[PDB]
């Protein structure tokens, strides 16, 4: 509880924002509130769809949710119907209409949201956290990440004392601002409590 | 030293006075509106201002007119 958020320290430099709308000060708050509710709603609903990150833009009294996922077939479903099934409930709780898109990642072993969701689900179905936490590092390093650091925290096997472990391999330079680090954090609600998982994935320098 | 125009009373104190003055000097009036002033047609009444756990009665005297009802009913008790 002493480090800066490595996605937030580099928001103009390397990473893009998850929202690319301008709103003047009279509608900025509500324009951020509905922006929150479609992220909560899509995150709750598409939990099996392996969603990486959703980007919301607002061109001219409309909205676009670009859904970054690993398996877009579960997202569009049969024929593309589930896109419109999402689009009706997006347009109900946002400013109607909606143009949602899919932007799949073809290398889901390098996305920090999907690694943390992987370790999260495997801890929910009670696997050994050295096997999961170590297998994520293996699967990134034999596929092309320049660095990775996974850390789990909590009870982790019903212990009465919480502890953390972390299995870095390679370079994760958190202070270099040009260094591209995808950091993300997920939470596993096991029957002994909450186990927090956070993963850094370093890819390149520019 | 506030409220430039007109004193303040509630309707449940104004109508309750104008009801209970023409109906004779009677039982002490339980009042919760501490924040209301004391009009000159309230002189001679035993009103019981609520202080938080009581309804303490105070006989309205002629000098009490410019004040408010909560001014003559203390809340905190010291020693």
């Amino acid at each position: 509880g002493q480090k800066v958020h490595p996605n937030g320290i580099r928001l103009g430099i390397v990473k893009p924002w998850n929202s690319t709308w301008f709103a003047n000060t009279k509608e900025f708050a509500d324009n951020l509130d509905s922006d929150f509710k479609v992220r909560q709603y899509l995150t709750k609903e598409l939990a099996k769809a392996s969603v990486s990150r959703i980007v919301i833009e607002r061109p001219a009294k409309s909205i676009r949710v670009t859904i970054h996922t690993a398996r877009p077939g579960i997202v569009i479903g049969k024929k593309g119907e589930d896109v419109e099934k999402l689009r009706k409930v997006v347009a109900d709780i946002a400013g109607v209409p909606a143009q949602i898109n899919i932007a799949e990642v073809r290398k889901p072993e390098l996305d920090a949201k999907l690694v943390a969701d992987s370790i999260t689900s495997q801890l929910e179905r009670r696997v050994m956290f050295r096997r999961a936490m170590k297998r994520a590092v293996q699967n990134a390093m034999r596929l092309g990440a320049k660095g990775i650091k996974v850390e789990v925290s909590g009870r982790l096997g019903g212990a009465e004392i919480a502890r953390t472990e972390w299995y870095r391999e390679g370079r994760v330079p958190l202070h270099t601002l040009r260094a591209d680090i995808d950091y993300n954090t997920s939470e596993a609600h096991t029957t002994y409590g909450v186990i927090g998982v956070k993963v850094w994935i370093f890819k390149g320098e520019i | 030293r506030s409220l430039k125009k007109g004193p303040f009373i509630d309707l449940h104190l104004l109508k309750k006075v104008e009801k209970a003055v023409e109906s004779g000097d009677k039982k002490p009036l339980r009042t919760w509106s501490r924040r209301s002033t004391i009009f000159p047609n309230m002189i001679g009444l035993t009103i019981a201002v609520h202080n938080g756990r009581q309804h303490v009665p105070v006989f309205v005297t002629d000098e009490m007119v410019g004040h408010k009802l909560g001014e003559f009913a203390p809340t905190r008790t010291y020693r």
């Binding site: - | 000098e63 009490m64 001014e71 003559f72 203390p74």
Partner: protein, 114 residues
Amino acid sequence: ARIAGINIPDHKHAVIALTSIYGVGKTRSKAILAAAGIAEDVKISELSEGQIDTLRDEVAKFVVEGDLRREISMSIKRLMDLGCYRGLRHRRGLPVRGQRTKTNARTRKGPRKP
């Protein structure tokens, strides 16, 4: 050098020199000289008696020493006789206006006996 009952300073300027009367300060003291046709920077030795008598009835308009003291005593004793919240603070020597009493309160209190 005798108006309203006392007025005895000298070698002082006039508008400051009138302010030893209990009931006048630097605004009403300018109102007296501006209403009695006297420049504000003259001395009480420099006034002639034909001006000072015109200042005595001038300051006889606004309320001064004795009437103001028995008047303020009538106000405080009136509030303490009603026994309101304010007069209830006056009967006990605590701040009336609603100041902090946990810590300071010390002008109205006095010195600290324990």
